């Protein structure tokens, strides 16, 4: 009864902090913001990093990434944003990765825990994602020792 069409294993999502998204014919995997934090917010004027992997569902043609916009700031794409015939485009170097990059210049503050909308535009497909912030493989920040009360 557990092996029918509605199966518990097969609809399971990746146990990662980034988000999946369908941009027309592009699969956006592990989309997340890298933004090390110190207080309740990361303030406007900080430059944070937007990371993802774009996978070409089609295997016949090629594709290219344009115009990532958001209402947290402006996104600069550096490098060759074309995703090949049946290949990937790694944008940013994630936490444990031992050069397309997406730089976000912030205009309003962001905080770890909330989701933020980003609009990806390919030459065939364009969608909004609601991206989280992921501290990656960074260690736990020290907490000041509490006194006796």
């Amino acid at each position: 009864c557990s092996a029918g069409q509605i199966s518990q294993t097969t609809t399971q999502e990746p146990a990662v902090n980034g988000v999946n998204a369908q941009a027309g014919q592009v699969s956006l995997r592990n989309v997340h913001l890298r933004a090390p934090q110190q207080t309740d917010y990361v303030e406007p004027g900080t430059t944070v990093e937007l990371l993802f992997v774009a996978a070409n569902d089609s295997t016949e043609g090629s594709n290219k990434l344009k115009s990532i916009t958001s209402d947290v700031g402006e996104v600069t794409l550096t490098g060759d944003s074309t995703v090949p015939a049946d290949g990937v485009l790694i944008v940013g170097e994630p936490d444990g990765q031992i050069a397309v990059t997406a730089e976000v210049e912030l205009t309003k503050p962001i905080t770890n825990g909330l989701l933020y909308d980003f609009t990806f535009t390919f030459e065939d497909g364009e969608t909004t994602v609601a991206v989280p912030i992921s501290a990656g493989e960074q260690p736990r920040r020290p907490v000041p020792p509490a006194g006796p009360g």
């Binding site: 518990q8 995997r29 992997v53 990937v88 994630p94 936490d95 990656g136």
Partner: protein, 223 residues
């Protein structure tokens, strides 16, 4: 290493693509994206034999591994190159760490295990049932690295414990408790499985009461 990366891709292509995709993006209703799951996820899933999966049901079981240690490293390196993620701890010689993962504070490990782990795995990692066909398994066969990466990656329905939620020293204390509660002998006789009242009540009825009634039959008469 480029050789390790091409061996991992070559192994991946005839074992994992049908469910995970040629670009590790996932095949819908068949298997999830592997981008950012990391080498640690590959190590846990392949070294315990859960991957490659064979069908969809409530829960994919552990089973004999389909790959050896170097092939597991190759697959983990290939997955790590696509999205990064957590890695499996290593020792000085670059081997997967086993003994150095045993923490020094087993009392803290036991307290942490009872808070975080025993709800699903039982007082002494004997396993427990989950909702509908699922179950937290018996912990007595996992090696230290498997325990560590199981906490690190959150497999199937097991919660994910980040290195910020449970620091590496806390994880090492937990693995010390898990390993020592698996290797300690029973003190009061045969351990009866470690589940408590249900097998103890089974032992009373099938051993103690059967003996007592048989002795009564021997002493008494019929008719």
């Amino acid at each position: 290493q480029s050789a390790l990366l091409r061996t991992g891709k070559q192994l991946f292509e005839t074992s994992c693509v049908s469910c995970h995709g040629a670009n590790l993006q996932g095949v819908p209703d068949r298997g999830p994206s592997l981008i950012g799951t990391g080498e640690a996820a590959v190590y846990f899933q392949v070294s315990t034999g859960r991957m490659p999966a064979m069908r969809g049901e409530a829960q994919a079981p552990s089973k004999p591994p389909h790959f050896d240690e170097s092939q597991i490293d190759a697959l983990g390196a290939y997955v790590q190159a696509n999205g990064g993620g957590p890695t499996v701890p290593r020792d000085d010689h670059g081997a997967v760490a086993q003994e150095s993962l045993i923490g020094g504070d087993v009392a803290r490990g036991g307290d942490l295990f009872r808070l975080n782990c025993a709800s699903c795995h039982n007082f002494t990692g004997k396993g427990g049932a989950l909702s509908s066909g699922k179950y937290a398994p018996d912990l007595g066969d996992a090696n230290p690295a498997q325990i560590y990466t199981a906490m690190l990656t959150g497999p199937q329905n097991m919660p994910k414990f980040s290195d910020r939620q449970l620091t590496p020293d806390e994880k090492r204390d937990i693995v010390a408790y898990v390993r020592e509660s698996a290797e300690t002998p029973s003190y009061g006789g045969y351990g009866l499985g470690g589940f408590g009242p249900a097998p103890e009540g089974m032992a009373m009825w099938i051993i103690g009461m059967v003996a007592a009634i048989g002795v009564a039959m021997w002493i008494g008469s019929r008719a």
